[PDB]
Amino acid sequence: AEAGITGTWYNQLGSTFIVTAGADGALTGTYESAVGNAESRYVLTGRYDSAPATDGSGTALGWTVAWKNNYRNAHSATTWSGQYVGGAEARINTQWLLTSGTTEANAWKSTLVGHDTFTKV
Amino acid sequence: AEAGITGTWYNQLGSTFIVTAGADGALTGTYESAVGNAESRYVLTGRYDSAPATDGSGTALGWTVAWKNNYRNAHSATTWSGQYVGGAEARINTQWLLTSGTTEANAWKSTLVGHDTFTKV
């Protein structure tokens, strides 16, 4: 459901991401703050199942955002893995991994894990 | 099994954990950084499958360590989830989650994820 995924999504932390789902399974867009100021916009790229099951299952997808743009660099990257569920109350349920660039000594604490639920409202 | 799990294990990061596997699935012991140092010893408790399959599968187990003892407190807790594999090269392969006590605002970055492999040597 490329038509179902394409659009603006909001999470519970105050972040917004606009994405376009290509017919070829590509996901491209921008991840930004609620405000949308230029310094807080980051490129996002991912992939999704462009031919999901028809037994009522969700649509598997994932995307990545490296936290660097033309204004700032947080030397880290986050990947979201989850599935899109359509309907009147459509949502994208995800779990993410945030990895920071670290020295070998700090590699053990380089990755944070969490979960985000995105809605169209 | 019980006899296979009970004993001293070492990870690839310099930590040592001594555990005793009870007949009914209990795991009890100590997790320490350096021997002969009271300030680096912490209590560990967990559970394991005391009647694993006999098809060559590993033995599921998990344990927790709250990073507080009578000398220090890191206000955090780590849980290891994995399986014990017996043999000449016995080991415990795990994935862990380290959660720190945080304010509501920092809850999103409260949990670290990683993996440890423990060996008898």
């Binding site: 972040s15 703050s33 100021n37 807080s40 | -």
Partner: peptide
Amino acid sequence: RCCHPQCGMVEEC
């Protein structure tokens, strides 16, 4: 409060 882009950071800290 938020000092990382992921938690919706608007202004640098």
